[PDB]
């Protein structure tokens, strides 16, 4: 009864997937499904600004949280 061999495909995850399903890195503030994703201002004066857009029914709110570090 022969030994068996294993074929391992590693290079489907050699490196992370490139970004664009047209999700935008930068927003300089209606626009498609960036919904539920975290956005952030560059940290200034020891405060985090976290952002995201969520859906309630047909309504969309972009919430900003100002949070000390």
């Amino acid at each position: 009864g022969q030994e068996m061999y294993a074929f391992r495909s590693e290079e489907r995850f050699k490196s992370p997937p490139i970004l664009p399903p047209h999700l935008l890195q930068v927003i300089l503030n209606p626009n498609h499904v960036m919904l539920n994703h975290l956005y952030a201002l560059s940290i200034k004066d020891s405060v985090m600004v976290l952002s995201a857009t969520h859906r309630y029914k047909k309504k969309y709110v972009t919430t900003l949280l100002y949070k000390p570090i």
Binding site: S15, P17, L19, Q25, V26, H37, A40, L50, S51, A52
Partner: protein, 104 residues
């Protein structure tokens, strides 16, 4: 406010980025599942409210040198009560960043 960035960017090794967020998750007592080497599902029990919150982490390559960690909230399924799914999502993210990450 002017420029909004999706998640956070890093020029650390991808494998380091992922290992560090994984140690961060375990430290914080969140539970996780590795869908992909670059894709995590994470769940936290709110120590105050006893509600659960879920989110996704996904790493993307943006340059030959640069990666972008993306956080995405996952949906469930008179004076207020404790809890806000959105704010709580912000705090998970923040905690994860604080505990795996240093401003370089």
């Amino acid at each position: 406010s002017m420029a909004w960035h999706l998640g956070i960017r890093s020029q650390s090794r991808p494998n380091d980025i992922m290992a560090e967020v994984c140690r961060a998750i375990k430290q914080l007592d969140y539970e996780w599942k590795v869908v992909n080497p670059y894709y995590l599902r994470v769940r936290r029990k709110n120590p105050v409210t006893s509600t659960f919150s879920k989110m996704s982490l996904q790493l993307y390559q943006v340059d030959s040198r640069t990666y972008l960690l993306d956080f995405r909230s996952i949906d469930d399924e008179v004076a207020p009560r404790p809890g806000s799914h959105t704010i709580e999502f912000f705090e998970m993210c923040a905690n994860l960043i604080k505990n795996s990450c240093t401003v370089n």
